[PDB]
């Protein structure tokens, strides 16, 4: 009977759609996506306004550019949650299986708790006014083009962190307990004037593009003092030379 409900509720949501969708193709896709429960379960470009209840055996979800309405429970997944450009609602709790979450170009204003060893995060183009603790196994971060202004700490294996064009007012209490080959820490276009005294403490294996920030003349001229000096062996920090 369980498959019978899913069939009938899918049919109702398919034929009470306000008449503007490719939901016939979406429906035979879901018939082959529950019958045999295909992997990937791609919903891209099919413009399903509302994603109904998904089968238990789901593996990886990929639904870019589909909705405007909230998702339901995503209960036990496996690898990639790829939910681009869909809606503004909260993310359901991630299970132990989830290791890659790309909610890029979404409109979630409050990123919920992201527990477990989540590895690959991509939350670019959002209105996150806050950000809770990040997992230790986070390794490729992308908070690019977000409205966060109080960026919390960083993990100990982050390599590429793009967080440019944010309302970041303070360079955070940096986790320079990280030793990645070249730290792709793109913080350009922030609201920074105050630089923590530890810029002499990070290694040269860093590019923090600190451009765009309104640095004070004194810290800027100290940066010139360390850069015009031929012994620049701190982070390869590209400052905003009126760029």
């Amino acid at each position: 009977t369980s498959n019978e409900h899913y069939l009938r509720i899918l049919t109702e949501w398919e034929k009470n759609s306000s008449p503007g969708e490719e939901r016939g193709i979406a429906f035979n896709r879901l018939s082959q996506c529950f019958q045999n429960q295909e992997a990937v379960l791609n919903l891209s470009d099919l413009n399903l306004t509302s994603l109904p209840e998904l089968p238990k055996h789901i593996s990886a979800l990929i639904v870019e550019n589909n909705k405007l309405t909230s998702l339901p429970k995503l209960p036990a997944f496996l690898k990639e949650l790829n939910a681009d450009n869909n809606r503004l609602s909260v993310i359901p709790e991630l299970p132990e299986s989830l290791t890659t979450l790309s909610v890029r170009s979404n409109q979630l204003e409050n990123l919920p708790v992201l527990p477990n060893h989540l590895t690959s995060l991509f939350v670019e183009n959002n209105r996150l006014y806050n950000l809770p603790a990040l997992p230790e196994k986070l390794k490729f971060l992308h908070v690019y083009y977000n409205r966060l202004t109080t960026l919390p700490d960083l993990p100990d294996k982050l390599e590429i962190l793009c967080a440019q064009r944010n309302n970041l007012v303070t360079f955070p209490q940096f986790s320079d307990r990280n030793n990645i080959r070249q730290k792709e820490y793109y913080f350009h276009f922030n609201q920074i004037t105050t630089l923590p005294e530890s810029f002499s403490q990070l290694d040269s294996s860093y590019r923090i593009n600190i451009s765009g920030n309104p640095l004070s003349t004194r810290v800027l001229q100290s940066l010139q003092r360390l850069t015009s000096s031929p012994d620049y062996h701190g982070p390869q920090i590209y400052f905003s030379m009126s760029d």
């Binding site: 183009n125 690019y144 793109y186 276009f189 030379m241």
Partner: protein
């Protein structure tokens, strides 16, 4: 070209002014990409990356039996997805492709090869070169319309023109394309103010001819009207300079009979003079359509004379910036137009 434009824009937004430099060759979009080493500071104007048959395999071509797995290890290139977005909401889907530091180390601990191409020895004479490491590909067909912008070289519009035109130029970008490329240098393991310059050239080029010059003008129509023929005549003229001979199958034959003087002797002054033209003019990026229009017009005198007043105002900055440091690009365009019609008119009126 919008390639120049939109790739400048993606540079500025994604990582403003780093080592990731835009692609300006509109038609030559994906000729160079990841694993395509084009580039040399081979006495260029600072910001130049010549489109040559030399790519990364053509400089560092491994020739062993372990190539079959080098296919995977070489096209392992990244396809990470970025969303470039401004007030050009809209999100152009780019792919960052960065050959990893591990392969950087392997190439450093490897060695170059023995049978290299003739283009290598032609271009790497005094080349402090750069190589493409992180490149920005296009994943989806991205035909996007756009208009124009520049800075304060709007003195042309201040003189008597107004510059109220519209650059509705909408170039197509198919999938698997290129936007911008990070440049880093592995250089080779050893394996007169131009007014007075232009006075000297004005003499040695007042030495020129009429019908030969009309072929000069037609040849520059094709050359500096569309991108491709610019590098065509560029390679031809550079070959004329280095080889110092003549192949009689050149469409530019009457200018060859012009650079070689009326007696057929190559005036090196005339050769370096067409070369300083091409330098100044390729510095005028995408001025090609306008200069072909200008040949059709016969109104170069107007163009310069405007920027003649403008050049005599602006002699501050090609003297302020040392020849080996970064110049002012706008002032270079200015002095370039001086060079354009100063010479071209001293030419176009008979000897």
């Amino acid at each position: 070209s919008v390639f120049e434009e939109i790739t400048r824009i993606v540079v500025k937004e994604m990582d403003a002014g780093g080592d990731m430099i835009a692609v300006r060759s509109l038609v030559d979009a994906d000729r160079f990409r990841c694993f395509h080493l084009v580039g040399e500071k081979r006495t260029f104007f600072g910001c130049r990356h010549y489109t040559t048959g030399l790519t990364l395999m053509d400089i560092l071509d491994t020739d062993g039996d372990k190539w079959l797995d080098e296919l995977d290890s070489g096209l392992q290139g990244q396809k990470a997805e970025f969303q470039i977005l401004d007030n050009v909401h809209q999100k152009i889907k780019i792919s960052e492709n960065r050959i990893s530091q591990q392969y950087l180390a392997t190439l450093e601990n490897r060695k170059l090869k023995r049978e290299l191409p003739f283009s290598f020895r032609s271009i790497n004479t005094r080349e402090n070169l750069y190589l493409v490491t992180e490149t920005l590909e296009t994943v989806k067909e991205e035909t996007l319309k756009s208009d124009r912008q520049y800075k304060f070289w709007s003195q042309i519009s201040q003189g008597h023109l107004s510059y109220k035109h519209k650059g509705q130029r909408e170039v197509t970008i198919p999938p698997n394309r290129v936007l911008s490329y990070r440049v880093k240098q592995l250089v080779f393991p050893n394996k007169r103010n131009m007014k007075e310059k232009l006075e000297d050239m004005e003499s040695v080029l007042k030495d020129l001819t009429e019908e030969k010059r009309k072929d000069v003008l037609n040849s520059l129509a094709k050359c500096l009207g569309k991108e491709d023929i610019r590098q065509d005549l560029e390679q031809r003229v550079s070959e004329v300079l280095i080889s110092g001979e003549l192949h009689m199958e050149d469409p530019d034959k009457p200018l060859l009979s012009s650079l070689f003087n009326a007696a057929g002797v190559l005036v090196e002054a005339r050769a370096k003079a067409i070369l300083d033209f091409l330098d100044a003019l390729l510095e005028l990026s995408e001025e090609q359509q306008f200069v072909a229009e200008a040949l059709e017009k016969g109104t170069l005198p107007l163009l310069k004379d405007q920027v003649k007043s403008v050049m005599e105002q602006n002699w501050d900055e090609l003297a302020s910036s040392p020849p080996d440091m970064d110049y002012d690009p706008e002032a270079r365009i200015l002095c370039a137009l001086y060079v354009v019609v100063s010479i071209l008119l001293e030419l176009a009126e008979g000897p």
